[PDB]
Symmetry: C3
Subunit: 158 residues, 3 copies
């Protein structure tokens, strides 16, 4: 059996992440979305909000579950007994921080594989930072994110 | 007529920008330098100062106008009725980012073209960030910027 | 004689820099590890702590000495009378930033050469930032740093 763990800040989750999750839920028996606290990033949404938004966006996929965590990813992946890390690779960078992330996690969790997917072309170039900045200036982001996310961002900047 | 809009933070405008603007005024009938507030960047100079510096550096160019804006670029370009985005490309450098930026603005402003110029060999490798940091440590920055900008940098840290 | 200066924040110094330093001490008569204050990065360790960790890690190399500084690199290098800048490329970070750095320093210190080494494959993916983050979450970092650094990181986070 394969259990893949998709770790990220998801602030917020976008159509880019969702495409990747869609594809991964058809490949693997179990997909865990691991939302990291990432306090250093000063996230726009709270961990609970990010987990909840990610849950809403994935509610239709039976083998996908969402959980938040504040610990070391290499510890958390053993705790989840997942044998595969999922990360998305868009163009291009980083990427190289992803190569660096994978090689450092290989030392800390040797039995976990690091694997990459690339999003549909249509949802590449979608970045959570840019979704946030467009929303904060009142731009329409409905083509970059799910409607609950769009609503959450709109209400957030009021 | 083409009305080209060149949007940046310009903190401060450098000889790299100035080169691009010289080149852009020779290609297009109307060039608007759109100086972004960019509060996330915590600019060294105020928007009002950054606009005054850009005005000073381009006042000799009759088809070039400068304005500050704090709104969504995709909204502001319509209020300005420009049909072309100008951006500069240097060493890699923030080049992925220009594709992603262009991609997302093509969704938000479908009718506006996105185009790129490159500055002379001589003004590549000039970053407004390194100019700020060198000046803040009392390094001589006069060879990276126009003289009014050099004075403002000197006065900025006294 | 060649006197090479190796500047960085070294927060903290890793086996990644130590490999570069080892290689440099066998090429040059004199190697200076220049630790930058870098107040903006808000370093985990104080300047004085980072200088001490760097001394501990290199004290077995007689031609290598460590010093801290808070001034402009281009002036400090004149103070140390070094004619060579050493910079490492922690794999493929942004050699374009190192270029922008080198050519701007070419303007401020024309008599100093910029030179680059790459670390052994084994240490080319160690990031002091990620070491700080793994250590802060109680992860084992003994495979990325010298034992004094591991001890120092351990004491820093309980
Ligand atoms: C060696 C190690 O163990 S690392 C030690 C430090 N920390 C930890 O262990 C705690 C765990 N931390 C994490 O899991 C984090 O998710 C990290 C460190 C893996 C990566 O940070 P992320 O949350 O993925 O955000 P990311 O680095 O991708 O930057 C956010 C951007 O990437 C996108 N993004 C966010 N999360 C992801 C993701 N999981 N996968 C792909 N893309 C993502 C967003 O669209 C966003 O767009 P932007 O570039 O304009 O901002
Ligand atoms: C979807 C989107 O378009 S964003 C939606 C939300 N935000 C907005 O709408 C705000 C609208 N304004 C903007 O987004 C800003 O103008 C931006 C990001 C397009 C431009 O910001 P920038 O000026 O490029 O800041 P940035 O630091 O990234 O500049 C990169 C480098 O190129 C130089 N530079 C500054 N402005 C420009 C410019 N317009 N073009 C080319 N180079 C520039 C600088 O010297 C800078 O050097 P540095 O990185 O060492 O500081
Ligand atoms: C040089 C000029 O005058 S331009 C103005 C800039 N600054 C000054 O004048 C003051 C002097 N400042 C310095 O010397 C600084 O060290 C700098 C800006 C030149 C370099 O900063 P860095 O120490 O490389 O820090 P960086 O932002 O890359 O982050 C530290 C990382 O760099 C790595 N690192 C630090 N120094 C080096 C180095 N000399 N070579 C290769 N890698 C390095 C570490 O692996 C660490 O890993 P990380 O990216 O995961 O955190």
């Amino acid at each position: 059996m394969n259990r893949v763990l998709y770790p990220g800040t998801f602030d917020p989750i976008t159509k880019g992440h969702g495409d990747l999750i869609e594809r991964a839920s058809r490949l693997f028996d179990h997909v865990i979305i691991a939302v990291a606290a990432s306090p250093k990033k000063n996230p726009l949404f709270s961990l609970e909000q990010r987990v909840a938004l990610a849950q809403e966006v994935t509610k239709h996929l039976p083998n996908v579950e969402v959980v938040g965590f504040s610990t070391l990813l290499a510890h958390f992946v053993k705790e989840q007994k997942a044998n595969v890390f999922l990360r998305g690779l868009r163009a291009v960078s980083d990427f190289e921080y992803e190569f660096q992330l994978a090689n450092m996690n290989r030392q800390l969790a040797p039995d976990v594989e690091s694997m990459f997917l690339t999003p549909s072309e249509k949802y590449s170039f979608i970045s959570s930072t840019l979704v946030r900045e467009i929303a904060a200036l009142g731009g329409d982001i409905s083509k970059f994110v799910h409607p609950a996310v769009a609503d959450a961002l709109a209400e957030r900047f009021k």
